[PDB]
Design a protein around this ligand. Structure first.
Ligand SMILES: OC[C@H]1O[C@@H](O[C@H]2[C@H](O)[C@H](O)[C@H](O[C@H]3[C@H](O)[C@H](O)[C@H](O[C@H]4[C@H](O)[C@H](O)[C@H](O)O[C@@H]4CO)O[C@@H]3CO)O[C@@H]2CO)[C@@H](O)[C@@H](O)[C@@H]1O
Ligand SMILES: OC[C@H]1O[C@@H](O)[C@@H](O)[C@@H](O)[C@@H]1O
Length: 563
């Protein structure tokens, strides 16, 4: 209760960031008040809200949140945050419609007293922002922005920083963005994470870490990147004796550390814990929900490998149903909601919950992972909602770093997932010790430039099924999409795609290798695409359905336009 107050409830002053702003831009109200509360993070102690109304009858009820200003600096090798001023309350809003808005502030504290501001008027003009990310109504396999443009996530996990904190994201995000990346994922737990809200407590949230998440969200805004916020990770509910980076003994949920839980199993049903968790969701919506750069709320990293003493499928399912419904109801902008599992096939009892808007796969597999990805993507089409391969690698033990310095494993996965019908790229691990130091971003740039002008929302892509392969000197395989106007092929050498010792192909690719015959009607334009340099190798106009395959070392992309 470091932030208690026991004065009669009064608004003391408000600051408004701007009277005029663009569609989907941040409108921020700062509020100085006094009142009676033991915990500014608990709406039963103090409840700040902004009530906004556009000219079209839509009303938004935005919970407010407690805020401390900081000034960051880098002390040789660690970030250090210096508090500036007293903490206070904020409301963060983002307008969907343009035109005029009226809003007022309402506050209630534990005494039952209620105060409110007069109504203020703001004006919203048109802007360049595409809006929030939703499931496409045209093709449930894909995401869209509110303005109808596709959102095809290309990026990686970038879930926490080193001790340099936000200064690491100052380096990683611009590199990702300039190489076609528009997506990453961050962790808000366990308590050691860069953005951990529950750092010392499950009842009060860490204002420094929340400030760091502000900063990284703002950087994503400037770079047109979109973030999945992962609220909790399995480590929090896993006992030391169970291994796999366990954290229960250190987590603030545990009664030993001041929390309400005697054991991780009680997380799903303990009424005190459920109440604090809803307060946390309210804090997250209040502080970050305005942002169109929040791609999705993700409840859990790999909830299936919490302690087996704590996984009760019926209670975990009901908890996801109830929390998705609650989160949805208090989120004025209705961001996408998801959850994840370490078991690659997932848990159908939870994945089929309608409050979870898309499903995920995590897979770390060293052999024939191309076939595993294709198989999992075909399988999860049963849910009729988008599928994100949210984590991918060779080995949960990190073998990738030593055996694949050139990123061939990432390469194979991102081409396989895009051209098998997943909503976006497979999302690699190892951002800090693999992708960045080895400068593997060029793999994403080549993929992004290949799909850049393809509208997956209108192509009605189906997986390629009835081709004839005519290759003699090699075991070539193909993964393809067939659509209205395009056929997209990724061909790979089964003997070379899983060998990681050779240097990146520098292909002087003239010779004829073989052919693939497809059920299409000429004429067609065939584009051969170097997947490593990210450029057209050759372009060919054809009058027959026999498409030559030129020589390639490891793999080759082909884009075929139906004319
Ligand atoms: O060093 C910072 C921080 O690291 C923490 O350990 C990390 C570890 O460095 C590594 O990045 C690990 O990656 C996991 C991650 O958990 C993924 O969600 C996923 O999971 C796997 C799980 O961790 C087990 O390995 C399990 O057997 O397999 C899962 C996948 O099926 O896979 C990633 C790659 O293994 O994440 C942990 C944190 O979970 C802590 O050491 C911390 O103290 C330290 O400060
Ligand atoms: O920014 C990511 C990394 O960049 C490197 O060049 C070093 O400066 C690291 O200390 C840092 O964590």
């Amino acid at each position: 209760s470091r932030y208690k107050d026991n004065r009669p409830l009064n608004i003391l002053g408000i600051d408004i960031s701007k009277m005029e702003l663009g569609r989907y831009n941040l409108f921020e109200v700062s509020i100085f008040l006094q009142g009676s509360y033991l915990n500014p993070f608990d709406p039963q102690e103090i409840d700040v809200e902004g009530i906004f109304e556009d000219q079209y009858g839509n009303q938004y009820r935005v919970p407010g949140f407690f805020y401390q200003e900081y000034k960051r600096e880098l002390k040789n090798d660690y970030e250090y945050l210096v508090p500036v001023g007293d903490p206070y309350f904020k409301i963060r809003f983002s307008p969907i419609n343009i035109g005029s808005y009226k809003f007022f502030i309402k506050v209630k504290d534990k005494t039952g007293r209620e105060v409110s501001s007069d109504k203020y008027t703001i004006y919203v003009k048109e802007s360049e922002k595409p809006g929030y990310i939703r499931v496409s109504e045209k093709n449930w396999r894909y995401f869209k922005f509110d303005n109808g443009r596709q959102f095809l996530p290309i990026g990686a996990n970038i879930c926490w920083a080193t001790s340099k904190g936000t200064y690491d994201y100052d380096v990683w995000l611009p590199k990702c963005a300039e190489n076609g990346g528009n997506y990453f994922r961050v962790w808000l737990g366990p308590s050691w994470a860069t953005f951990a809200l529950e750092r010392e407590s499950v009842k009060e949230y860490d204002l420094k870490n929340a400030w760091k998440l502000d900063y990284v969200l703002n950087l994503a805004e400037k770079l047109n990147m979109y973030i999945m916020f992962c609220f909790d990770s399995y480590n929090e509910l896993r006992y030391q004796k169970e291994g796999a980076y366990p954290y229960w003994e250190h987590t603030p949920h545990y009664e030993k550390n001041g929390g309400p839980l005697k054991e991780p199993k009680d997380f799903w049903t303990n009424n005190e814990m459920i109440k604090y968790y809803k307060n946390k969701l309210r804090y997250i919506v209040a502080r970050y929900g305005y942002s169109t750069n929040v791609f999705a709320w993700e409840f859990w990293n790999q909830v299936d490998i919490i302690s087996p003493t704590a996984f009760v499928i019926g209670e975990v399912k009901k908890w996801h149903e109830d929390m998705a419904k609650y989160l949805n109801s208090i989120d004025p902008w209705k961001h996408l909601i998801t959850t994840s599992f370490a078991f690659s096939p997932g848990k159908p009892e939870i994945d089929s919950i309608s409050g979870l808007n898309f499903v995920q796969t995590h897979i770390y597999k060293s052999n024939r992972y191309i076939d595993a990805l294709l198989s999992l993507i075909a399988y999860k089409e049963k849910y009729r909602k988008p599928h994100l391969v949210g984590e991918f690698g060779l080995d949960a033990g990190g073998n990738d770093l030593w055996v694949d310095p050139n990123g061939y494993v990432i390469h194979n996965a991102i081409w396989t997932t895009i051209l098998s019908g997943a909503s976006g790229t497979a999302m690699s691990w190892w951002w800090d010790n693999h992708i960045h130091p080895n400068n593997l971003y060029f793999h994403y740039r080549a993929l992004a430039d290949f799909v850049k002008d393809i509208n997956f929302l209108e192509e009605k892509f189906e997986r390629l099924t009835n081709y004839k392969f005519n290759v003699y000197n090699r075991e070539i395989k193909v993964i393809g999409l067939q659509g209205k106007k395009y056929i997209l092929l990724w061909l790979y050498n089964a003997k070379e795609a899983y060998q990681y010792k050779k240097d990146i192909p520098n292909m002087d690719s003239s010779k004829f290798l073989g052919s693939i015959e497809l059920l299409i009607k000429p004429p067609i334009k065939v584009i051969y695409y170097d997947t490593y340099r990210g450029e057209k190798i050759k372009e060919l106009d054809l009058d027959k359905n026999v498409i030559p395959i030129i020589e390639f070392e490891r793999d080759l992309a082909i884009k075929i336009e139906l004319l």
